[PDB]
Amino acid sequence: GCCGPYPNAACHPCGCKVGRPPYCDRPSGG
Length: 30
Known about the structure:
This protein has one helix at 22-25. The protein is low in regular secondary structure.
């Protein structure tokens, strides 16, 4: 239970932990 790509208050493409876009599951940094 997260939100996703639709509008821009708390709702973000990869705002979640598990289940999210290619760049956010690929190695970010820290």
